[PDB]
Amino acid sequence: CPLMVKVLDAVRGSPAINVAVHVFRKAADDTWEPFASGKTSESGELHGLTTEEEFVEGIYKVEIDTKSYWKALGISPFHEHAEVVFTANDSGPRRYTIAALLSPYSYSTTAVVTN
Amino acid sequence: CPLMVKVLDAVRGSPAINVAVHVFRKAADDTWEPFASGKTSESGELHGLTTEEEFVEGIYKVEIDTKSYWKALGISPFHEHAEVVFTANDSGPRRYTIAALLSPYSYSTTAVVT
Amino acid sequence: CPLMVKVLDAVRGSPAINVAVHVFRKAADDTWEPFASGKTSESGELHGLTTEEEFVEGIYKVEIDTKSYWKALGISPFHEHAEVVFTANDSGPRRYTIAALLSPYSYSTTAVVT
Amino acid sequence: CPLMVKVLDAVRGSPAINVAVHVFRKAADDTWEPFASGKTSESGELHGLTTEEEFVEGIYKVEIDTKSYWKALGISPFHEHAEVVFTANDSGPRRYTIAALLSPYSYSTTAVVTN
Ligand SMILES: Oc1c(Cl)cc(-c2ccc(Cl)c(Cl)c2Cl)cc1Cl
Ligand SMILES: Oc1c(Cl)cc(-c2ccc(Cl)c(Cl)c2Cl)cc1Cl
Numbered sequence: 001c002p003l004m005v006k007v008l009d010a011v012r013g014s015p016a017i018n019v020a021v022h023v024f025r026k027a028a029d030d031t032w033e034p035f036a037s038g039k040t041s042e043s044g045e046l047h048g049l050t051t052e053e054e055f056v057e058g059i060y061k062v063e064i065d066t067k068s069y070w071k072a073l074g075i076s077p078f079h080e081h082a083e084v085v086f087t088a089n090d091s092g093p094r095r096y097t098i099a100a101l102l103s104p105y106s107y108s109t110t111a112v113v114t115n
Numbered sequence: 116c117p118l119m120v121k122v123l124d125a126v127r128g129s130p131a132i133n134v135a136v137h138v139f140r141k142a143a144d145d146t147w148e149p150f151a152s153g154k155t156s157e158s159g160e161l162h163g164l165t166t167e168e169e170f171v172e173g174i175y176k177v178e179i180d181t182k183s184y185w186k187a188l189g190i191s192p193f194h195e196h197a198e199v200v201f202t203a204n205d206s207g208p209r210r211y212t213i214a215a216l217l218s219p220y221s222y223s224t225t226a227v228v229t
Numbered sequence: 230c231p232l233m234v235k236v237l238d239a240v241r242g243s244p245a246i247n248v249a250v251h252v253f254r255k256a257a258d259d260t261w262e263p264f265a266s267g268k269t270s271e272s273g274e275l276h277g278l279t280t281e282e283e284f285v286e287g288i289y290k291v292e293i294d295t296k297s298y299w300k301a302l303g304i305s306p307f308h309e310h311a312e313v314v315f316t317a318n319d320s321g322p323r324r325y326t327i328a329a330l331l332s333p334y335s336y337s338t339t340a341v342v343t
Numbered sequence: 344c345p346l347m348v349k350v351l352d353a354v355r356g357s358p359a360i361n362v363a364v365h366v367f368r369k370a371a372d373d374t375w376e377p378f379a380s381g382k383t384s385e386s387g388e389l390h391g392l393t394t395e396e397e398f399v400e401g402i403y404k405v406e407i408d409t410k411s412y413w414k415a416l417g418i419s420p421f422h423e424h425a426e427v428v429f430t431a432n433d434s435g436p437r438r439y440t441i442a443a444l445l446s447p448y449s450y451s452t453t454a455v456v457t458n
């Protein structure tokens with residue numbers, strides 16, 4: 001599992017459950033093509049987005065649909081979504097964990113990259 | 116000044132200076148049009164991006180070129196850039212401050228709307 | 230102004246106003262002595278805590294009463310307060326800005342030393 | 344396992360390994376008494392600090408020795424340590440995960456609290 005997303009809710013002190021996540025890969029022309037998508041589980045995690053074989057070198061965008069999340073909670077948040085754009089696997093296969101911490105007007109994102 | 120950006124460096128404990136910032140507005144056809152751009156100053160701030168007249172309701176993207184910033188410091192960064200996408204909503208008089216706190220493998224962004 | 234505190238509210242996207250802040254210096258015998266205190270202003274800032282003459286090298290603790298802040302907003306917080314403990318080091322002319330970004334179950338603090 | 348600590352390094356994009364963590368409990372007089380201590384593992388996690396039986400209601404302070412961590416890496420950091428002070432178990436036993444994200448001049452801490 002080379003690409004994992006973990007999302008926490010800083011207002012409730014809990015995992016952010018059912019957050020939609022879309023991943024895109026920058027194509028040979030500089031259009032973002034859809035790559036994978038999913039929703040966080042009860043633990044706020046999203047696994048199984050892709051495989052080592054499919055997860056080739058490139059620039060990827062992970063888009064976390066934070067707006068829908070906060071709206072469903074009755075909070076009107078600032079951001080449309082949180083997005084994380086990174087070059088992946090440019091010197092060999094790595095495992096990427098993209099973690100995000102969400103508040104209505106703020107989010108933080110961190111990457112843990114393992115060999 | 117309806118839109119201000121402030122960028123801090125969490126590694127050195129200093130403003131992030133000379134960081135390129137590009138602002139885009141979403142156009143009618145799903146597409147991002149250049150709207151404003153600048154480089155953060157010595158205090159890590161960027162002002163005078165736009166005016167109240169010009170800054171109408173819409174979806175905006177603030178793109179902070181964090182990669183070049185870290186590269187200049189000889190530190191290999193994770194992100195291609197930091198992006199902040201938000202709807203400017205205009206109901207009442209509103210100043211938007213977009214602040215980013217930069218680390219090589221992490222960033223945080225917060226909006227202060229006053 | 231050698232020491233400044235700024236507190237932001239990540240839930241409402243606003244300065245955190247009227248937040249009590251207490252600053253302590255570590256004394257000779259391992260113990261924390263009151264040093265300065267105040268309440269953040271309408272811009273979520275606290276200035277004039279101390280002077281250059283008084284702010285000597287030492288270990289300082291900045292305690293931000295985040296609990297009362299959230300309680301006033303009817304939101305149950307996790308932390309008793311936020312604490313920031315650092316050595317003031319004085320080598321060269323230095324202003325310390327301590328910024329805190331508050332959420333009910335999380336906070337971030339960063340230091341800007343310029 | 345009612346109290347867990349997870350520590351990440353935002354400079355290296357990796358878990359923060361071998362970070363010393365001391366936990367204190369506020370005593371019947373308002374002195375912090377030592378409660379538990381340990382070091383983060385290779386995954387940046389610290390488990391087994393305490394048991395449900397021992398982890399009674401009270402105010403706890405988790406102190407993360409960030410200074411030693413950064414010094415061992417040749418970075419001179421700002422903070423002496425990161426500390427998280429919270430009331431625990433005041434309406435029944437909960438499981439607490441204290442997560443911290445470390446940079447030389449900044450850290451963030453979040454709590455995930457589960458039933
Ligand atoms: O800011 C944070 C961010 Cl963005 C993520 C985490 C975090 C907490 C628990 C886990 Cl298990 C992981 Cl992977 C992360 Cl990255 C913790 C903090 Cl304090
Ligand atoms: O995480 C933070 C972020 Cl994203 C921003 C700031 C911050 C520091 C100084 C200033 Cl002047 C401002 Cl407006 C901000 Cl929002 C402080 C922290 Cl701790």
